[PDB]
Nucleic acid binder design. Structure first.
Lengths: 62, 195, 76, 129, 224, 48, 72, 95
RNA sequence: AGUCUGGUGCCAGCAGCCGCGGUAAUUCCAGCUCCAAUAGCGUAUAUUAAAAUUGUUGCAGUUAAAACGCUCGUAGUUGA
RNA sequence: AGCAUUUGUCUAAAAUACUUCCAUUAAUCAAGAACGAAAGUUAAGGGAGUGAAGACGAUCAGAUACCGUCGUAAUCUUAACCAUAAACUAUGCCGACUAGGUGUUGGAUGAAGUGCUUCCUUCAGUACCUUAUGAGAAAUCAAAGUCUUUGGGUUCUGGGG
């Protein structure tokens, strides 16, 4: 902790996760980065997003 | 008070056999030039009182088992069984008894009183497999494997065994509601001895 | 509990604290009665002073004196 | 012959603790041993100890708490970088969180946590948990 | 379901004086009747199932003048998925009987694992809280803590068994004849079993003693 | 006791012992010895 | 999570499945030398018992709590 | 020739529930077994009666290693009703 | 992922390895079905991991491979 | 390796005891060296018994073997060589730590049988029995223990058949 490289790179990586939509607002710590999990990542595919939002009637249709 | 010590003293319980043994070295007073070990006694009396407190502290006395397998000690333990609430098992040990749940004879006790650890050794070992602590009448030749409170005593003399049990019984009765510490107990020492 | 055990004196040379079992002795010779400094465990022959008559015979133990003589310990 | 004093001392302590002896007598006292026991004492993994004098190196009698699972000495005295420390601790200690890996540094003998806080590598002495 | 108890501990558990399995674990008592384990973890109206699995059935033969005399040895794994594993071994004449007996043995063996975490309080437990090693025969297995950024990095067998115990993420290693399947399982079980024996900072401090169930409910046994 | 040297300057002994003992292995002998390029009919080509 | 017992004699953790470990309840007296309700308790590990050192350890423990007079 | 477990076991059970009636005659014992037991063969009933007679005959030379009995309870009632130098030094030392 | 269907019948063959094939072949030769990966998928040879079977970390040497016949001793390594 | 009659002479040796001296002089050691059973070799003696070779008589389908009778070489001393042996505790050597009891050979210290004798305590040799919540693949091992909780020092060695 407080290591210069660590604070910089960790924050930068975490910010990138926020941009991706992998971690919510409340979480902001590296153990939630470790906590990232494969369905959570798949949930951010564009096909998935369309299926959720509508437009198509099926994942395959999307 | 003195009287217990004196009554014990007149009986030959102070004469341990040969073969000192390391763990009992602290309870031996000195080896007599003859080749027998004299036993402190005073420590035995204090120890005996401690043992009485642990026996008394068990609310169900039926869960307190006496065990022996020598005829001349058998009478002593049966009498002990009559006077306190403790059940004795005398004669040949049943060597599955404590470990085996489904055997007919069974018994899962809470405490064990053993007459000679060398003699009753399987019962002592079995006791260890199911968390029973074992108070022990212990002698010159005793190992102390799985025995907690060790009571120095000659275990081999019939008078010695009888005297030892008789004092133990008297202490537990005094601790209980039976008799005030002023009065001598009614039962003869002679009553617990073999015939 | 080996920090301060008193009756350890009986153990071999090399205990908790080194201590020699060897000491010096104030000795005097019967019938000649002069004081002499002498060593319990003396390794060579030991004479009385006025006329050289042997006192102690050396041998590989504690040394055996003579049948006579009287011995104080010469520790301070 | 003995060579490094320290290794015998921990080996002796460790046997006593595994055995359940409560107190134990470490035979060849030294400056390093005093520092090691005192360091162990500071972080509460061993009790009070009496160094009894002689005139030939003393002896020490150390009170065990019934708490040391394992203590040993790393030999030879490997050099180790401040950077390397994480890889050492991961290798040796039973957990990242607890137990201590002990070094000798220009700023004195201390565990890794202290070294990390300070700065300075050094040589690795031993460890306990 | 609702059997007649053989012994005092069993009788107390049937009646419901004994709160939960922790109490008997606390006083390290011999959990002789399988019913005791079964009552605490009965699969409905309780927090989590006990899940069985036959891990390995192996043929063994005595060899006689007449012929072979084939018995079936069976290794079975039981686990709650939340802190309790059990390793059961039964050798019997015929297969279905052997499996059934093995499940009984597995329930009897049941041990609580200590669980902890790699870094911080902000997760519930997820790994083996310090390095623990269990040996049996040739084969020595070491469980070593890993961050949650992991799964169980181990042998199929280790993964299954550790998962059964309810430890999510670990680094594992092994040395010796892992192919001797039973021994490997026993070694794994011993390694898991050792976990609550360790003594660590979380447990340095002194504490009090609860009364033993045999003393706390002495009256309730004495009445029968 | 431990049987291998340990010392802070003992690197020489460790290198020399390992270097010789490497020649014990069957696989290693096949890879590093000259016999290979001779007795192999394809001369260590995959195909022919 | 549960908290396992730690030994009175050895200060060490009592295993989950040990069976060799025991809780010995020692009764206090009332002033007359008759049995009080209350109990000073000791927990003795399997390990000292298996060795056979239990009496010696127990004696020192009793002295520390101030029950047995003589110590060792 | 001897007697098997089934025979001996039965022999022990009789006496156990009918000691008072049983007696030192074989024919009377045989009459008692015929009344008491459920055995279906003549030869077997006789065999049991013979062995019960033999056990009854055996008793009155102390215990038969089985069967609770009133006679024992009564018997139990009949059954129930200076020093060495260093040892002196020890007594002196204690006080 | 097949005790499915035909042909062969110790032959033809398969089979890294264990093994399969002597008349019901869950392994051949087919057909049918099923399965793995997929615009990629097989095979060979080399090479790294697996190998804590080259071992500093980190092996083994009573009996499985392995303590020099024994001792002194220079270099070496190690040294209250 | 090996060493058992008597006495003498020349030699070494270890333990003990030591308020004696020196003050790290050490530990293990590739290179190199000393010694190195038995057989065998070379040379002189020597030559009883034993006895590879060999010769016979048997035994056996056969017997160049087991068994039998005889019998060279070798076996013995001196003087050279040879350098291996299941040259075996099949356990490298030094160093610390662990656990009892039974002994025993060698000293030294105290006390108790008739100066001497014995026992106690204690060293150093040295075995055994029990015990290992020690170890080991087990047999078993007080070292093969103090080990995946892996590092007191070091020489040598092994890596499927």
């Amino acid at each position: 902790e407080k290591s210069s490289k660590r604070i910089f790179q960790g924050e930068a990586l975490l910010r990138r996760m926020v941009r991706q939509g992998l971690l919510g607002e409340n979480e902001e710590k590296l153990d939630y980065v470790l906590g990232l999990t494969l369905p959570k990542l798949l949930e951010r595919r564009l096909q998935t997003k369309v299926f959720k939002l509508g437009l198509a009637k099926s994942v395959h249709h999307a | 008070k003195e009287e217990s010590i004196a009554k014990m003293l007149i009986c030959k319980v102070h004469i341990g056999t040969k073969n000192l043994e390391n763990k009992m070295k602290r309870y031996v007073y000195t080896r007599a030039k003859d080749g027998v070990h004299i036993i402190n006694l005073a420590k035995t009396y204090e120890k005996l009182q401690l043992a009485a407190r642990i026996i008394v502290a068990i609310s169900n006395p039926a869960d307190v088992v006496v065990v022996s397998a020598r005829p001349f000690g058998s009478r002593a333990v049966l009498k002990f069984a009559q006077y306190t609430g403790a059940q004795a098992i005398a004669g040949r040990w049943t060597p599955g008894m404590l470990t085996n749940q489904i055997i007919q004879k069974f018994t899962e006790p809470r405490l064990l009183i053993v007459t000679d650890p060398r003699t009753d050794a399987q019962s002592v070992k079995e006791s260890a497999y199911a968390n029973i602590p074992v108070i022990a009448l212990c002698d010159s030749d005793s190992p102390l494997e799985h025995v907690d409170i060790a009571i120095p005593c000659n275990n081999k003399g019939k008078e010695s065994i009888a005297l030892m049990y008789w004092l133990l019984a008297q202490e537990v009765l005094y601790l209980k509601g039976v008799i005030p510490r002023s009065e001598p107990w009614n039962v003869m020492v002679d009553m617990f001895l073999w015939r | 509990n080996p920090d301060p055990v008193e009756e350890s004196k009986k153990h071999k040379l090399k205990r908790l604290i080194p201590t020699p079992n060897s000491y010096f002795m104030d000795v005097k010779c019967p019938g000649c009665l002069q004081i002499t400094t002498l060593f319990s465990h003396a390794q060579n022959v030991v004479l009385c002073g006025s006329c050289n008559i042997m006192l102690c015979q050396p041998t590989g133990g504690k040394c055996k004196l003579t049948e006579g003589c009287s011995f104080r310990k010469k520790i301070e | 012959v003995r060579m490094s004093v320290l290794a015998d001392c921990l080996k002796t302590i460790n046997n006593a603790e595994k055995r359940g002896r409560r107190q134990v007598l470490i035979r060849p006292s030294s400056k390093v041993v005093i520092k090691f026991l005192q360091y162990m004492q500071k972080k509460g993994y061993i009790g009070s100890f009496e160094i009894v004098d002689d005139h030939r190196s003393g002896k020490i009698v150390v009170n065990l708490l019934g708490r040391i699972n394992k203590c040993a000495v790393i030999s030879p005295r490997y050099d180790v970088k401040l950077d390397e420390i994480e890889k050492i601790i991961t290798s040796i200690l039973p957990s990242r969180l607890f137990g201590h890996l002990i070094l000798t540094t220009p700023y004195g003998i201390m565990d890794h946590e202290e070294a990390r806080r300070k700065h300075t590598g050094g040589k690795v002495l031993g460890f306990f948990f | 379901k609702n059997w007649v108890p053989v012994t005092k501990l069993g009788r107390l558990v049937k009646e419901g004086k004994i709160v939960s399995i922790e109490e008997i674990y606390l006083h390290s008592l011999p959990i002789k009747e399988y019913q005791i384990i079964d009552y605490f973890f009965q699969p409905n109206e309780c927090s989590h199932p006990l899940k069985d699995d036959v891990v390995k059935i192996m043929p063994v033969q005595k060899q006689t003048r007449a012929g072979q005399r084939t018995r079936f040895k069976a290794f079975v794994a039981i686990g709650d998925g939340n802190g309790h594993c059990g390793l059961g071994v039964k050798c019997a004449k015929e297969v279905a009987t052997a499996i059934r007996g093995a499940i009984i043995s597995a329930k009897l063996s049941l041990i609580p694992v200590r669980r902890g975490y790699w870094g911080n309080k902000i997760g519930d437990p997820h790994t083996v809280p310090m390095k623990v090693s269990g040996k049996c025969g040739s084969v020595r297995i070491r469980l070593v803590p890993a961050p949650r950024g992991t799964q169980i990095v181990g042998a199929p067998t280790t993964k299954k068994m550790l998962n059964f115990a309810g430890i999510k993420d670990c680094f594992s290693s092994s040395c010796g004849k892992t192919k001797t399947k039973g021994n490997f399982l026993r070694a794994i079980f011993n390694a898991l079993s050792k976990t609550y024996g360790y003594l660590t900072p979380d447990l340095w401090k002194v504490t009090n003693f609860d009364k033993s169930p045999y003393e706390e409910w002495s009256d309730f046994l004495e009445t029968y | 006791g431990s049987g291998k040297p340990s010392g802070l300057r003992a690197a020489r002994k460790l290198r020399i012992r390992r270097r010789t003992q490497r020649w014990a292995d069957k696989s290693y002998k096949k890879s590093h010895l000259g016999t290979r390029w001779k007795s192999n009919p394809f001369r260590g080509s995959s195909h022919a | 999570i549960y908290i396992p017992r730690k030994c009175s004699a050895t200060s060490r953790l009592i295993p989950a499945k040990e069976h060799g470990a025991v809780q010995i309840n020692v009764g206090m007296v009332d002033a007359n030398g008759v049995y009080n309700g209350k109990t000073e308790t000791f927990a003795i590990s399997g390990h000292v018992r298996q060795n056979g050192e239990s009496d010696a350890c127990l004696n020192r423990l009793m002295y520390e709590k101030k029950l047995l007079s003589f110590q060792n | 020739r001897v007697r098997t477990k089934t025979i001996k076991r039965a022999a022990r059970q009789i006496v156990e529930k009918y000691y008072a009636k049983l007696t030192l005659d074989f024919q009377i014992n045989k009459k008692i077994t015929e009344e008491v037991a459920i055995i279906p063969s003549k030869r077997m009933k006789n065999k049991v009666a013979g062995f019960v007679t033999h056990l009854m005959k055996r008793i009155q030379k102390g215990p038969v290693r089985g069967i609770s009995l009133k006679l024992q309870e009564e018997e139990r009632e009949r059954r129930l009703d200076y020093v060495e130098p260093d040892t002196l030094r020890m007594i002196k030392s204690l006080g």
